[PDB]
Amino acid sequence: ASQVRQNYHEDCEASINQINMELYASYVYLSMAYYFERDDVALPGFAKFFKESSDEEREHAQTFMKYQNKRGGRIVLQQIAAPSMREWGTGLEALQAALDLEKQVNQSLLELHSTASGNNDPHLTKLLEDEYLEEQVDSIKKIGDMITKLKRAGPTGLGEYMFDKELN
Amino acid sequence: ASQVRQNYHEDCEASINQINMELYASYVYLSMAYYFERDDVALPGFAKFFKESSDEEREHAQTFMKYQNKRGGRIVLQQIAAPSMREWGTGLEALQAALDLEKQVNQSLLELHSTASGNNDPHLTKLLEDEYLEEQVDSIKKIGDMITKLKRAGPTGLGEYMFDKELN
Amino acid sequence: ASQVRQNYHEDCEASINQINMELYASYVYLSMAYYFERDDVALPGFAKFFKESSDEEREHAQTFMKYQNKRGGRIVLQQIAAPSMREWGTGLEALQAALDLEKQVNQSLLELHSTASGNNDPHLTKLLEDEYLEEQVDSIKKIGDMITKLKRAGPTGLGEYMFDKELN
Amino acid sequence: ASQVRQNYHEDCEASINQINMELYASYVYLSMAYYFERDDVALPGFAKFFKESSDEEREHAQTFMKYQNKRGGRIVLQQIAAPSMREWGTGLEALQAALDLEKQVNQSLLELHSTASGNNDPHLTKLLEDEYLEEQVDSIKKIGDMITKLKRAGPTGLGEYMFDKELN
Ligand SMILES: [Fe+3]
Ligand SMILES: [Fe+3]
Ligand SMILES: [Fe+3]
Ligand SMILES: [Fe+3]
Ligand SMILES: [Hg+2]
Ligand SMILES: [Hg+2]
Ligand SMILES: [Hg+2]
Ligand SMILES: [Hg+2]
């Protein structure tokens, strides 16, 4: 094993290899970002919001890869599936898909925390609490807020046009 | 009595112990402020306005406590009643309740001015005029304007969204 | 349930609504602060120390309210009970009551942490460790030191006068 | 009468000619200020405190002289009586005499306010409330505080020496 490896169970190492999910989350949001720059969609505020979301998921994946190396695990990269859905529809329908996605990632993150806790890895539980679970709750609450605000503004038409601008 | 007490009636001293009313009004606005940060409400402009209102009612109570000590009275702190509701409805409904609350505090402040006048305490009538009654009238006028503007913008829907931005 | 709620058990949500206990603590220390500005007490250093304590305790409560909303729980505000006393005695007696109130809050916060651990909510255990338990131990240690310093300086008379200046 | 006098009653004009009382209080504090600079007293903080008090009482008299002229009345100066004592005792005893004199002046001001109210002179009641009664209550609270602090420090000996310093 690695000269650095210590108290790092093979179950966590393989669970970390979550990297693929973060990269998938990054790619969903990249799809969303450029869907909204379409000449027949033209929602630059949503575009910028999802471009940033895509960058952050990719960084989240890179922190996990860096963590793999710190502990002596070995990174195994797999293919990144494309989103099954290309036409995200309205801004509200994209936000509802992002909420669900943000929410599947956080379940995965909470499952990896339970694995880490069961195998008495406090370095891993600390990482997850400080670098991931905190960000995930903020992101989910934010998107919820955005959904509520867009339904108030009027999920389609003028309210969608005005909500996009406060988002730019 | 206190070595500093002079021309200070025990009825005014009891009426000042108004301190409880200000703290309650501060507690109503704190309730409103965080209600507007719910993920299913998300009115960040209403939230801020009522966060500022809550701080500045609490400062009102502290100026009364300091006054109590200045004149040689003794501060008796009572329980702060829970705010009359959990949920405050629309932003319009919350402005209406704040208007009702502001006029109730004004009426209490005017009654304390009458007691102070009746017992020939010009230092108290000065306090109430310069530090409370002026700002109460200004506050009541502000909230009334805001109610008129929000009814104009359309008390619900896009108008509430756009009026909230104004207020942020 | 809220669109954002996940892994948020109803017992933790009820226990968070700790908010009331924070607000009560804020109200005890506000009572202390203005007691020490009485013309027959005049301890401006103690007064400043407890004004600041009262601000901090109200901020802790607001962070619990902001937290209740992040997780999708609902804030249920409560009456704030009067401080058990009008008058707090010597500066030492006020410090001793504060130490005891700080330990009572710490026990409550430890109990909330237990229930959060038992229901496998690491986002909430992180909140409690990073935002409350650390500060709580530092505050208790601080008041311990002060009690020791004030007994050394001579809890009454000139020593209390000199200790108070060091606190201003 | 003057080209300016309007709603100015003769008994208020004679009550303002308070000028003499302010000048006497100024002279008392001038006596205290230099008493505390005697080589066998040597209390520079008390000395500075009373120097400033004497300056401020003189300004109060001057504002009344200006006020007399503003209203069309005529200033009649009278003999300024000597302070009743050459020597003021301990620091505590000087503060007690000053408290007594602050309350005698305050009472005189309150009687002039009643006179002004009975003759429906709101210009003069505003003068009194804003330029004298407010500063008078603050002065009395301050001196009250100082007396309690000095008794706490230990009205004589080391405590008197330390308290004078915090006053410097
Ligand atoms: Fe992520
Ligand atoms: Fe107020
Ligand atoms: Fe706290
Ligand atoms: Fe004066
Ligand atoms: Hg593991
Ligand atoms: Hg009264
Ligand atoms: Hg729980
Ligand atoms: Hg008069």
UniProtKB/TrEMBL annotation, chains A, B, C, D:
Residues that bind Fe(3+) 1: E22, E57
Binding site for Fe(3+) 7: E57, E102
GO biological process, one term: intracellular iron ion homeostasis
Gene Ontology annotations for the cellular component aspect, listed alphabetically: cytoplasm
UniProt entry keywords in alphabetical sequence: Iron, Iron storage, Metal-binding, Oxidoreductase, Zinc
Reactions that this protein is recorded to catalyse: 4 Fe(2+) + O2 + 4 H(+) = 4 Fe(3+) + 2 H2O
Domain of life: Eukaryota
Any Pfam family hit: Ferritin
Name of this chain's protein: Ferritin
